[PDB]
């Protein structure tokens, strides 16, 4: 669990997927707040997972680093409005229906294990995106793959001493 | 911020020279060995040492020839405001903690109002030493929840 020896909040019993009893600020007391936060976390995880390879692949393929419009605005506004139109609390977190033609929802236990795996990978991808954003600030104009190569030059340490103490 | 150091302030030098010249004007009125002249001669040296010390500490003078104080937190001027501030805070906390601890001790008596006029010196002398560790005492009491009624 989040850190052993700490009592968990009453609203986090360890039954929810990806739950580890983490709430040092207690921002999820109200049930409606918890449902909204669950949905928001799922959306963030999915977007970050979809985005990270789209940033990395350019540099690997040598096309460059990560550093029409009306159609895009219309499509995104329509998609988000249509998603917002849904009313069921359960269907918003997982819409199912025809969106999963491969039929991976047949097995319940496998479904729950997949849910836990997806949540964990989403947290990892979100942390990776934060890492990318902070990395760009320290070394302007340098992509993450070049930073990895420079680390491979000196595989000793995360070079924060060169930055934290100039 | 457009300020110059004391040691390179022509107006500072002019102020020192003018004060010395004014002081020496009254020295000529008395005999050199007389007591008023001896007392006056001790004033000139005090002025000279004060000006030398002000120049030696890196104080900043403006166009007036008068030192200015910088309290924005610069590490080169921590002696102007930051260093004396912590000392005052420590002393005031000592006084407040002693005063608060005396009242609590006598609150349980049958007539606590009588001890506020005729101070119990043997009881007060014991509490006085306890104010030395007031920061730790207050930090521990805040966590336990006994600070606020």
């Amino acid at each position: 669990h989040w850190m052993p020896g700490e009592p968990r909040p009453a609203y986090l019993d360890g039954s929810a997927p990806g739950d580890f009893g983490f709430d040092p600020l207690g921002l999820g007391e109200v049930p409606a707040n918890l449902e909204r936060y669950k949905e928001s976390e799922l959306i963030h995880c999915r977007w970050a997972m979809l985005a990270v390879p789209g940033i990395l692949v350019p540099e690997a393929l040598g096309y460059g680093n990560w550093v029409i419009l009306a159609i895009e605005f219309l499509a995104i506004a329509f998609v988000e409005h249509q998603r917002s139109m849904e009313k069921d609390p359960e269907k918003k977190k997982y819409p199912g229906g025809a969106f999963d033609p491969l039929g991976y929802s047949k097995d319940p236990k496998k479904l729950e294990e997949l849910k836990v795996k997806e949540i964990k990978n989403g947290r990892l991808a979100l942390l990776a995106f934060v890492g990318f954003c902070v990395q760009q600030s320290a070394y302007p104009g340098t992509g993450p793959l070049e930073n990895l190569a420079t680390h491979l030059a000196d595989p000793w340490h995360n070079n924060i001493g060169d930055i934290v103490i100039p | 911020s457009g300020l110059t150091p004391c040691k390179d302030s022509k107006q500072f030098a002019k102020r020192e020279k003018q004060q010395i010249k004014k002081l020496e004007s009254s020295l000529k009125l008395y005999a050199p060995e007389s007591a008023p002249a001896l007392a006056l001669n001790a004033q000139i040296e005090k002025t000279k040492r004060r000006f030398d010390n002000y120049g030696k500490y890196g104080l900043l003078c403006g166009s007036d020839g008068l030192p200015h104080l910088i309290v924005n937190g610069d590490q080169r001027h921590w002696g102007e405001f930051i260093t004396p501030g912590i000392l005052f805070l420590y002393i005031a906390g000592w006084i407040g903690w002693v005063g608060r601890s005396y009242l609590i001790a006598i609150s349980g008596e049958k007539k606590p109002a009588m001890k506020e006029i005729i101070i119990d010196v043997p009881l007060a002398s014991r509490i006085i030493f306890r104010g030395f560790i007031w920061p730790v005492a207050a930090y521990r009491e805040f966590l336990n929840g006994d600070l606020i009624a």
Binding site: - | K46, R49, R50, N53, Y54, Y57, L59, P67, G79, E80, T83, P84, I117, I118, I119, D120, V121
Partner: protein, 41 residues
């Protein structure tokens, strides 16, 4: 006597003694470290 101690512990006399000692001390530092504007330590 006991009355002598009791009269000496009354608020005005004790306050006057404390403030006199305080003023003497403050004059002592002001004489020992005259014309002070910054901490040289």
């Amino acid at each position: 006597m006991r009355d002598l101690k009791t009269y000496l512990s009354v608020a005005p006399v004790l306050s006057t003694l404390w403030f006199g000692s305080l003023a003497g001390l403050l004059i002592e530092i002001n004489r020992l470290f005259p014309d002070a504007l910054t901490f040289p330590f």
